[PDB]
Design an enzyme around this catalytic site. Sequence first.
Site, PDB file in Angstrom:
ATOM      1  N   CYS A 195       0.846  -1.196   0.000  1.00 27.55           N
ATOM      2  CA  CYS A 195       0.000   0.000   0.000  1.00 27.55           C
ATOM      3  C   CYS A 195       0.881   1.246   0.000  1.00 27.55           C
ATOM      4  CB  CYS A 195      -0.920   0.031   1.221  1.00 27.55           C
ATOM      5  SG  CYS A 195      -1.900  -1.478   1.427  1.00 27.55           S
TER       6      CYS A 195
ATOM      7  N   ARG B 230      -5.003   6.278  -2.017  1.00 26.69           N
ATOM      8  CA  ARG B 230      -4.084   5.185  -1.749  1.00 26.69           C
ATOM      9  C   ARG B 230      -4.194   4.114  -2.835  1.00 26.69           C
ATOM     10  NH1 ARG B 230      -6.285   1.772   2.321  1.00 26.69           N
ATOM     11  NH2 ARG B 230      -4.292   0.628   2.420  1.00 26.69           N
TER      12      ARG B 230
ATOM     13  N   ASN C 249      -0.910  -1.664   5.628  1.00 24.05           N
ATOM     14  CA  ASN C 249      -0.312  -2.831   6.231  1.00 24.05           C
ATOM     15  C   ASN C 249       0.997  -2.457   6.951  1.00 24.05           C
ATOM     16  OD1 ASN C 249      -1.652  -5.404   6.305  1.00 24.05           O
ATOM     17  ND2 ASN C 249       0.356  -6.254   5.726  1.00 24.05           N
TER      18      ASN C 249
END
Lengths: 323, 323, 323, 323
Positions: free
Chosen positions: D1, D15, D78
């Site tokens: 990410c 994102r 993450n």
Amino acid sequence: CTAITYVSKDHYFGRNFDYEISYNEVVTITPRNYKFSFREVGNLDHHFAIIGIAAGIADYPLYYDAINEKGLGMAGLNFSGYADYKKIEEGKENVSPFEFIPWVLGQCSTVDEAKKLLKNLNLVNINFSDELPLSPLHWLLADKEQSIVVESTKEGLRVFDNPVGVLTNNPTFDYQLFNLNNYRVLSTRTPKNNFSDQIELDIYSRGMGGIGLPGDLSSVSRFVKATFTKLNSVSRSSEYESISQFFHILSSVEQQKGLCDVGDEKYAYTIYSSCCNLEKGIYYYRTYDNSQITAVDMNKENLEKDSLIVYPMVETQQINYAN
Amino acid sequence: CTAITYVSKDHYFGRNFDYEISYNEVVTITPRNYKFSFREVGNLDHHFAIIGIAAGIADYPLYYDAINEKGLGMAGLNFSGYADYKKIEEGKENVSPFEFIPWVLGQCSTVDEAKKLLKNLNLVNINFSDELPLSPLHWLLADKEQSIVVESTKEGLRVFDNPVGVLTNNPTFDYQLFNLNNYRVLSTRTPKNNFSDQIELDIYSRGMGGIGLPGDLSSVSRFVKATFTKLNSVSRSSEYESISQFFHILSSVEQQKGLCDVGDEKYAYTIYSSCCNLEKGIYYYRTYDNSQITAVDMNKENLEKDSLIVYPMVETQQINYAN
Amino acid sequence: CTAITYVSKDHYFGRNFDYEISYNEVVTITPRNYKFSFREVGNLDHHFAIIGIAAGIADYPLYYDAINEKGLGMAGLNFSGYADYKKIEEGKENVSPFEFIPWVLGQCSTVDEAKKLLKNLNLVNINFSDELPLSPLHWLLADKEQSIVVESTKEGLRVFDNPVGVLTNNPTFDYQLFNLNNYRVLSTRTPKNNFSDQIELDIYSRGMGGIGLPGDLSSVSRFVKATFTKLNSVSRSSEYESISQFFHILSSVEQQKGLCDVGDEKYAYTIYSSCCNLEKGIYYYRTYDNSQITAVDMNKENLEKDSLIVYPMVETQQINYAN
Amino acid sequence: CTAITYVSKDHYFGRNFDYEISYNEVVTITPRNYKFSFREVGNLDHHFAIIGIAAGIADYPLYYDAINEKGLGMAGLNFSGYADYKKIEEGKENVSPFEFIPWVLGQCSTVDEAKKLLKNLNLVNINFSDELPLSPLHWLLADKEQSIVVESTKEGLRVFDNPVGVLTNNPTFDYQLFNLNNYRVLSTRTPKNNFSDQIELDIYSRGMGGIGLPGDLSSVSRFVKATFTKLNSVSRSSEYESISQFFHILSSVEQQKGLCDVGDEKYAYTIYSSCCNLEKGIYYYRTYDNSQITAVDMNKENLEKDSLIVYPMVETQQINYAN
């Protein structure tokens, strides 16, 4: 292997010899009246004196590198898979790779003189002996004015001008120079923050100029690092300071034992490092396990002899116990 | 600077000393009865004997690095901008950076003993004198069992276990350790073609397993290459072979004059490189302009004395003229 | 510029067009009976139909890239300082670079047919007009079997087999392929800890296998990244998933406005990205400011026409407003 | 990410979501009277409207990221092995990470209000359900003034000002920021030849100022490339040119299928890319298999309702057939 030139006040020539096994390397002074017999061109019965390191397994001087009494140096370096040696060609000066250094250094005072002799050269696939077949090599030649690279490949024979006075191994010298273009940004000084003027980036270290310079032991990486280190070295005040600087340049791309496995945990390392003063005819050297510099002065020999003068290499650590 | 430990049979400790001006670096043995007076802690009239290189100042052994008779080694390396020294703090052992090497080495026989001592440490911002203010530093300590790193920063005092036995300059040791994670793929052996099984890529050079190893003179790059060089090094147990390999490790990250400009052509270089045998109490060194290894053995001094024993450094080339 | 071939079930050909100014780009179908009049070779009054993007500044198809109805593609990519065009040459088929894509795509069904035609080629220095001088280019050609690269340099005309189905800009294709040798270790999988088995290094990120892959917008970097991404792509065999993967590959090496300053804050950027289905005669494109894929299908036209069929390029964002 | 902010008249937040499996991602609008029940803190029966993408695996809005009607954006990325959630602590505000986006966006209009709300936060290790265990995450929050990073790690909870408007995965944000120092020399312009003034190096390609920018898919490399690409992007003020540039920044560090094998040929890929206009409350997005931008305008719903409004995602290529 890495060969370099370096100018301080005198002019210097030399190389790291990098390999996994040492034969019997010896320093050999080939005097003037040691007859050079060549398999396919005219013999040189009287020729320029030569000092170099050589394989001590024959009565003939099998030089890995050498300088002559007139300030012209020459070195052969591994060129595996790239070197190609030819059949005899009528009309050409047919010279074997094993004869090549004696052929040039025997009759040339200068790189310009060598460039003319090389015009009709054809490097021919003739072994010294059945026991000792030809190595695949390319050559750096250098004097106090300039250096050149000699590469005989499948395409043919090329003689390049060397604007950086460095040579390593594969690939061809045209690729080696071209790859330098990728490093134009590197510097000896702290770079400006060009990344972004929106953020402050901190100069947390000295020497950030050089980030990007490669540190591995591959042929291309060593060529770039050696070139950057040589071009940007200072000159020094004395002989002793100068050869210091020179050996620092060679240390920059040396191969430490354990780092370059070539096979079944078989380790390629810098067996010796040489630095030759072209004006004084002195062959200085270090070995992996003797950090002291040894000097062999070709002019201390009787250069009118007709037989090789062969010195074993000082191979064990020479320590100054000072208390 | 770069500092390392290395094990062959014996355990070795030493550093590159990297700076742009040499002052009066001298090998200094501090014998057992040279009284250590500390500005803010309890004095040591009797302590372990020490050998190391110091700034050559009559009144106190201002060490850059040293080892003691018990095989504990310690070195200060530059840490500019990161180092933070503190106000006197009550209930702590308040010790100045300039006193720190004598404080630990004087009373510690092992790193474990240093760990316990350091629990109570507060490094305080007291100069040796008005003419001689503190340097910003951090420290590598090592014995035959392990090494640690000591960093006093604005957030406070940390003691790190050092699993690679290497230290350079900025940033904090935790970052330095972490960054190694990025180098997991480097190898001493030729890599496989993982790029694509659909094309053949040629192994045109030896040492391609190291590609990606940084070769610049910055702090982090030198940390990565010293580490890789040290961890993959091989050597015989014999002393000469072992210190030879150690000095090659230090050579792999030394700073050549001309390559690190710290501001208007003032060049940082590796003024000296040391190697200390912890078991035999021998301080070996090379200098930028002397490639021969010099040994000073603390055990040949009278270590019951109470005056400093000072040796000038052999700083010019000690060359073997062999012919 | 970057051009690629890709196989899923069908075969795809396309490129990124990367430049600082737009020359009124249009999708042009050249039908079969659009007469080609060549300046130095024979006319083609009846030929294969062609669909490509062209500079819409003449009633002549000035293609940057195209495919034909028989599934052969060709693309011209910047080759500035390397391209050399020639004087007219006797006994050769003297084709101008501006005529080159029509010359080949008009009469060849396959790369093998193009190879035969190319044996007799001399690319001549003839401008379309005094108002549009020739661009320095080199070319990728591709069908469902293979791809080739054509470079007319000062040394002459070379046709290479292209084992990766990729091409960018300078330097010559031989360097570009050789340089891949340097990236043999790159992987799609997490690498083993080869650095040293004496220390634990943590896999703190996915994707570590690619570390070393260059991310800048330079020609060699982009060649390396497009090659790695193309050769390691997966996708299922459907049209939409195939072209999706293809535009993902081109996206990896596109040039974002602001990032490549060619002059005085003049920004070279990916004006369009193309993907052509060789079997189906569909030209798919995106543009910098329209992320939607547009499709023009050569076969929905009357290919027996004798005049150019020109579609405007959709160059403003086509957004699906979901509420 | 990778999550970014970007400014171009309006202010944008967005994102890439990179994972190897899909959890039925939907765009979900949470209106002002949809009741949020919190396990350990006070309920929000009335709150600000939110729009974002969520895992469509429960009737509760499990947002991966979102913005509220007041211009405040928050995203979860993450942070595997780095994230650490705590036991309930008396005198804290005890919030589960699944609750965290609704907790903040429900009740803050600005990043400063978020800072104040965060001062007493304790992120607690409490699962949404037995069936859906927490994910290890860190967060980016942004408004039109500034952005911040929130990292709950073993050592505690930290809130950083984010001077680059970028975040990826591991390690901690302080290391990510520090690492940018290494890239201070990268430029959008061609650098001078600093390597050596003694030789000529050619500018054979455009974008050479970027050489060194890492181009792999790992967390740090994407942070560095996204940062250079965002900070150097040239902004067009109109809406379509602005979101177009934004999506090119996010394409710069997207993860292509086949290139990141997370074990057993399971591939991590950019499942979606989002771009939210904070001022206008529009959630724009692309998916790996749909290049066309889709837009969901929160302000076109009745935000006074009390039930979630779901827009399922478009997951075919939406091709514009032009002929």
